[PDB]
Amino acid sequence: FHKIRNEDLIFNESLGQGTFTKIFKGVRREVGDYGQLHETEVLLKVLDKAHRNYSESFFEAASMMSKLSHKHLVLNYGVCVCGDENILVQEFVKFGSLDTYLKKNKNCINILWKLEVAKQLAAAMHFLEENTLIHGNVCAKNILLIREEDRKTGNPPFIKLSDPGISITVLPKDILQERIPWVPPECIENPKNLNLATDKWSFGTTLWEICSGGDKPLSALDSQRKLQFYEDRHQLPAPKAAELANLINNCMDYEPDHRPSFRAIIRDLNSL
Numbered sequence: 001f002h003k004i005r006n007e008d009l010i011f012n013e014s015l016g017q018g019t020f021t022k023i024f025k026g027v028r029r030e031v032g033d034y035g036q037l038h039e040t041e042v043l044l045k046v047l048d049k050a051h052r053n054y055s056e057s058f059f060e061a062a063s064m065m066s067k068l069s070h071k072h073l074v075l076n077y078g079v080c081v082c083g084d085e086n087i088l089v090q091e092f093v094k095f096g097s098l099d100t101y102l103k104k105n106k107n108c109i110n111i112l113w114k115l116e117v118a119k120q121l122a123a124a125m126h127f128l129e130e131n132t133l134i135h136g137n138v139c140a141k142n143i144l145l146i147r148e149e150d151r152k153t154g155n156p157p158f159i160k161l162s163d164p165g166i167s168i169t170v171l172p173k174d175i176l177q178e179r180i181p182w183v184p185p186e187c188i189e190n191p192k193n194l195n196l197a198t199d200k201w202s203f204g205t206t207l208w209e210i211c212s213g214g215d216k217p218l219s220a221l222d223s224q225r226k227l228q229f230y231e232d233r234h235q236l237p238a239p240k241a242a243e244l245a246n247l248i249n250n251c252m253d254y255e256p257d258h259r260p261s262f263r264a265i266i267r268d269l270n271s272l
């Protein structure tokens with residue numbers, strides 16, 4: 001990771017929080033192509049001082065994904081360690097997380113839009129699967145909308161997948177249980193069961209989010225009832241747009257080894 005000086009970064013408005021992170025819009029001053037001076041909008045992710053023990057996990061996940069390059073994976077510019085804080089410096093995506101966008105535009109998004117987004121997400125996961133890289137935190141919040149659909153241009157929306165954040169192999173059990181049903185049942189049984197099959201399950205949950213206008217599945221259940229959900233082997237109800245219900249339940253298979261490959265997922269998406 002390129003190290004960026006604190007002096008080249010301006011912190012602007014808070015954009016909220018992630019897991020043990022604060023999120024800010026910012027600006028980075030840089031010498032760009034042809035020696036031209038640039039002021040680039042950037043997305044700053046700050047690992048809170050209180051959770052400094054988690055520093056290594058957050059930056060190792062960002063780092064391993066950034067060693068790959070792909071059109072559906074977010075760009076990291078570097079890190080800023082010059083100070084009291086550990087900061088990831090990331091490209092600023094104009095429209096933000098998908099879950100927020102879905103809620104704000106529920107009445108204006110149709111099935112073709114959702115399919116286009118699901119295909120792009122599967123393409124990114126296929127790429128990661130072929131490179132045997134585990135993301136570990138696939139969710140609508142971690143999907144970024146680069147561009148909206150422009151009916152007058154025929155151009156479709158474009159999304160990117162954000163960095164994994166802290167690994168579920170090191171998170172507290174309370175956060176893990178609260179992340180049901182994105183976290184697979186076998187990772188609740190044992191966080192060290194993190195595997196490629198993990199991302200197949202979370203892809204299904206994310207698909208449910210997309211098909212549900214940005215609702216959070218099982219949000220009415222507290223932590224103990226979310227555990228009970230897995231104990232009794234329940235499946236999510238069919239979302240509003242039910243066309244993807246079968247794919248969702250196929251991905252959310254309690255048997256990790258029976259979950260389909262993303263190649264097969266893409267074939268099924270393409271059959272609609």
Ligand SMILES: N#Cc1ccc(Nc2nc(N)n(C(=O)Nc3ccc(OCC(=O)O)cc3)n2)cc1
Nearest residue numbers: 015018019043091092093094095096141162165
């Ligand atoms: N209003 C508004 C607005 C507009 C544009 C943006 N843009 C923007 N550009 C990037 N790169 N962004 C993110 O990476 N976001 C993000 C932050 C925290 C996350 O946490 C996951 C977890 O840690 O659990 C996950 C994703 N976001 C953001 C907000």
